[PDB]
């Protein structure tokens with residue numbers, strides 16, 4: 001349909017779409033109030049992802065940013081997505097572990113700064129400044145990952161085995177997947193064009209589908225979502 | 229003052245404005261913590277509506293979108309309004325019925341997607357794509373209306389008669405009024421210019437004032453807002 | 457680095473930055489769940505402030521708005537900041553006083569309208585309309601300050617002496633500092649160029665650092681954050 005990345009944008013749209021329908025069907029009939037929350041948070045994530053990928057496929061989520069002299073194609077839609085989508089995931093983890101409201105707020109705020117800053121960076125005209133924002137964004141992410149890995153884990157150890165083990169898997173998955181985004185951003189169209197928009201869109205696609213559908217699958221198929 | 233719809237924008241500004249002052253006065257002195265919530269949610273709704281209509285009257289909430297060849301006047305302010313305003317209404321219904329947090333979250337998310345998608349649609353350059361977004365938006369709305377009509381009603385039947393009956397009226401009103409927006413959008417300046425911006429603004433005005441002031445009146449005048 | 461206000465933007469960036477690090481260090485090791493909330497809300501405030509000042513220093517948070525004929529430099533970043541930052545402060549006050557959810561919602565909404573309206577005003581092309589938005593914004597602020605001064609105080613009197621006294625100081629500080637913003641706006645680049653962007657940025661800088669770091673200091677150093 002034009003841009004060479006369109007295909008990956010198309011597959012992501014479809015996969016996020018199918019992931020949503022699958023979770024909607026699976027959560028059908030669930031009466032446990034605690035399970036309801038998990039199904040609602042986890043299903044909304046890909047749902048949002050669906051709408052944003054579609055805006056990128058249709059060309060809407062793409063804008064033009066000048067820097068480095070030449071012209072640059074920046075998909076701003078990703079930030080619109082991640083803005084609500086990363087915190088929701090954090091909410092799933094927090095509920096699983098029964099995190100204190102104080103830490104949930106700190107984590108959501110750090111997330112908002114992470115994405116807000118990432119977005120600013122992506123739209124900054126002075127090529128050199130874009131990295132400053134990257135550094136601030138990455139620092140916010142490391143703060144989140146630090147709390148998830150050391151703070152939540154400890155909270156998870158006070159739960160029953162099924163809950164503790166599922167949190168462990170989800171924790172490992174988010175830490176690994178999340179840390180890949182700033183790398184992809186840095187070596188891609190947003191930072192250094194070392195990697196073509198072509199290959200980047202493919203990476204974000206695998207990362208996103210894994211972080212949402214995959215994450216959703218691991219969580220929604222375990223009995224950890226039931227308070228018992 | 230220029231555009232032929234200005235008058236309806238003016239009456240809406242005034243009515244939303246008067247509706248706010250009226251509710252502010254009526255909620256004065258209320259000490260019941262549960263009633264306070266209802267008064268706060270219900271009063272903020274028209275208050276937000278006030279500010280957005282004014283931006284449309286003054287020309288600020290109007291932008292220009294190219295599609296179908298010719299030029300199109302799109303009031304984006306409505307989405308800014310509805311973005312916070314539709315969920316608040318959902319919150320009133322949820323409190324009345326004491327809905328589970330899981331469903332409140334799902335409903336607020338579906339609402340966010342509904343408006344976010346509606347906005348995208350309204351600002352899309354490819355005339356044909358605008359309808360795709362309409363379809364997604366309408367699907368989100370039908371999901372909300374489905375849960376309100378069948379899920380909330382059942383929750384409402386566990387409450388005392390005054391609460392159950394008031395929820396019934398509000399439920400009927402929102403289902404009917406809400407379903408009219410996508411129709412108006414489709415046959416109006418946002419979709420097919422079958423209906424002139426002139427008549428459309430009049431429709432949204434009646435719909436909005438009914439959905440907020442009317443809804444506010446029905447709710448704020450019943451003892452259903454008191455937990456007893 | 458160009459614009460004459462750059463220096464104040466630089467000092468604000470640094471002070472907000474140092475204020476965040478200081479609070480992050482101070483809140484380290486705190487286990488009280490109630491203290492955690494206060495530290496999270498109070499630390500995020502300057503953190504957000506940091507990111508926005510930096511966007512203004514680097515030129516990103518500055519835009520051009522035509523009105524009064526001549527050209528006008530408007531830093532929109534301040535609203536992006538205040539949008540999340542003013543409510544957080546309100547949340548600190550509400551927790552301290554254990555305010556009803558209804559009033560917290562009303563206050564957050566009034567705040568959202570205050571900033572949203574202030575932003576609209578700042579970006580309006582018709583010089584005369586900018587003041588209409590100012591008036592609406594100021595009315596929302598007075599509503600907040602009224603509730604904080606008379607409503608919260610009363611709520612504060614049911615708490616122990618340390619809490620009541622700390623709320624008193626914070627209450628006095630916010631009322632005074634908050635009321636200065638609409639004055640600065642009115643006599644500055646946003647309204648009447650009586651005061652040069654040079655002196656204005658200096659004022660907002662002192663006001664902001666006082667409202668956040670100062671406020672943070674007064675609150676985070678008292679035992680009022682401990683539910684005991």
Ligand SMILES: CC(C)CCC[C@@H](C)CCC[C@@H](C)CCC[C@@H](C)CCOC[C@@H](CO[C@H]1O[C@H](CO)[C@@H](O)[C@H](O)[C@H]1O[C@H]1O[C@H](CO[C@@H]2O[C@H](CO)[C@H](O)[C@H](OS(=O)(=O)O)[C@H]2O)[C@@H](O)[C@H](O)[C@@H]1O)OCC[C@H](C)CCC[C@H](C)CCC[C@H](C)CCCC(C)C
Pocket residue numbers: 044048051059060061062063064076077079080081083084088119123291292293307311333336337339340341343344345347348351353
């Ligand atoms: C309502 C919604 C739910 C609120 C969501 C939160 C919101 C605050 C933030 C999302 C954050 C952030 C990522 C967005 C900000 C980034 C910013 C830089 C981009 C803004 O653009 C997005 C705007 C579109 O603007 C368009 O309209 C205006 C006015 O009419 C135009 O002035 C502007 O130019 C338009 O831009 C579009 O077109 C551009 C095209 O550029 C060129 O234009 C010329 C014509 O002039 C030619 O057509 C060129 O063609 S050619 O010659 O080159 O061939 C053409 O290139 C593009 O470049 C632009 O990219 C753009 O397409 O819209 C706002 C989007 C909304 C807010 C997204 C909704 C997202 C989703 C549904 C949200 C669900 C959220 C829900 C609330 C979660 C609930 C969670 C619960 C708690 C659980």
Ligand SMILES: CC(C)CCC[C@@H](C)CCC[C@@H](C)CCC[C@@H](C)CCOC[C@@H](CO[C@H]1O[C@H](CO)[C@@H](O)[C@H](O)[C@H]1O[C@H]1O[C@H](CO[C@@H]2O[C@H](CO)[C@H](O)[C@H](OS(=O)(=O)O)[C@H]2O)[C@@H](O)[C@H](O)[C@@H]1O)OCC[C@H](C)CCC[C@H](C)CCC[C@H](C)CCCC(C)C
Pocket residue numbers: 272276279287288289290291292304305307308309311312316347351519520521535539561564565567568569571572573575576579581
């Ligand atoms: C802070 C606030 C509380 C946050 C609210 C949430 C926010 C994320 C989203 C609202 C969602 C969504 C609907 C908005 C996105 C849609 C997007 C496409 C529109 C963006 O425009 C809105 C911007 C204005 O941009 C303007 O400034 C920039 C920078 O200076 C310009 O680049 C831009 O062009 C400007 O656009 C205005 O002017 C345009 C004029 O076009 C032409 O311009 C030329 C000059 O170049 C000539 O003047 C032309 O004249 S002529 O020749 O034709 O004769 C002229 O036509 C217009 O076309 C544009 O439409 C526009 O007027 O501002 C952002 C608005 C804010 C966010 C709205 C605040 C709303 C309300 C107060 C919110 C209350 C919320 C509260 C938080 C709820 C709490 C609830 C509790 C939980 C209970």
Ligand SMILES: CC(C)CCC[C@@H](C)CCC[C@@H](C)CCC[C@@H](C)CCOC[C@@H](CO[C@H]1O[C@H](CO)[C@@H](O)[C@H](O)[C@H]1O[C@H]1O[C@H](CO[C@@H]2O[C@H](CO)[C@H](O)[C@H](OS(=O)(=O)O)[C@H]2O)[C@@H](O)[C@H](O)[C@@H]1O)OCC[C@H](C)CCC[C@H](C)CCC[C@H](C)CCCC(C)C
Pocket residue numbers: 063064065079083105108109111112113115116117119120123125500504507515516517518519520532533535536537539540544575579
């Ligand atoms: C994701 C984030 C967390 C969501 C935050 C909430 C969000 C809904 C609202 C913030 C509210 C409000 C204040 C913003 C709306 C105001 C609006 C008018 C301004 C919009 O601009 C901001 C956009 C940038 O747009 C830029 O990109 C588009 C698309 O590519 C361009 O079309 C647009 O023009 C760009 O504008 C920038 O550049 C302009 C430059 O103008 C001229 O441009 C030419 C080239 O064309 C030349 O370069 C000129 O140079 S020269 O010749 O004159 O020499 C040049 O002047 C500037 O004028 C513009 O000002 C702008 O720089 O981005 C959106 C910003 C994001 C959303 C901010 C993130 C803020 C922070 C990190 C948020 C933390 C929030 C967290 C969620 C809190 C959690 C709290 C818990 C509950 C506790």
Ligand SMILES: *C/C=C(C)/C=C/C=C(C)/C=C/C1=C(C)CCCC1(C)C
Pocket residue numbers: 082085086089114115118119133134135137138139141178179181182185208211212
């Ligand atoms: C479903 C989407 C997910 C889980 C997205 C996660 C995204 C991130 C962890 C993004 C992080 C970034 C930085 C740390 C700095 C560079 C800019 C970003 C936004 C790519």
Ligand SMILES: *C/C=C(C)/C=C/C=C(C)/C=C/C1=C(C)CCCC1(C)C
Pocket residue numbers: 310313314317342343346347361362363365366367369406407409410413436439440
């Ligand atoms: C006070 C305002 C109210 C109750 C607004 C309700 C608005 C809707 C239910 C809008 C729905 C739409 C669709 C279903 C698709 C077409 C686009 C919209 C946003 C008009």
Ligand SMILES: *C/C=C(C)/C=C/C=C(C)/C=C/C1=C(C)CCCC1(C)C
Pocket residue numbers: 538541542545570571574575589590591593594595597634635637638641664667668
């Ligand atoms: C950390 C930042 C703080 C405490 C900011 C407070 C800002 C205000 C109270 C702003 C108020 C305004 C009006 C009342 C109308 C004029 C426009 C504003 C946004 C400057």
Ligand SMILES: CCCCCCCCS[C@@H]1O[C@H](CO)[C@@H](O)[C@H](O)[C@H]1O
Pocket residue numbers: 023024026027028029030031036039040041043044047330331334335337338341367368371375
């Ligand atoms: C475009 C529409 C997007 C809709 C996103 C909604 C996510 C809904 S999850 C769903 O929420 C119900 C509460 O309504 C629970 O009862 C179910 O068990 C649970 O699975």
Ligand SMILES: CCCCCCCCS[C@@H]1O[C@H](CO)[C@@H](O)[C@H](O)[C@H]1O
Pocket residue numbers: 251252254255256257258259264267268269271272275558559562563565566569595596599603
């Ligand atoms: C521009 C200003 C917009 C303000 C919107 C605020 C809606 C306030 S409702 C009001 O909230 C109080 C708590 O403060 C309760 O005590 C009252 O009973 C109730 O009626």
Ligand SMILES: CCCCCCCCS[C@@H]1O[C@H](CO)[C@@H](O)[C@H](O)[C@H]1O
Pocket residue numbers: 102103106107109110113139140143147479480482483484485486487492495496497499500503
């Ligand atoms: C760019 C990163 C911005 C991060 C902002 C986070 C504010 C964190 S406050 C911190 O939150 C912890 C919970 O994680 C509590 O345990 C600590 O006692 C408290 O002091």
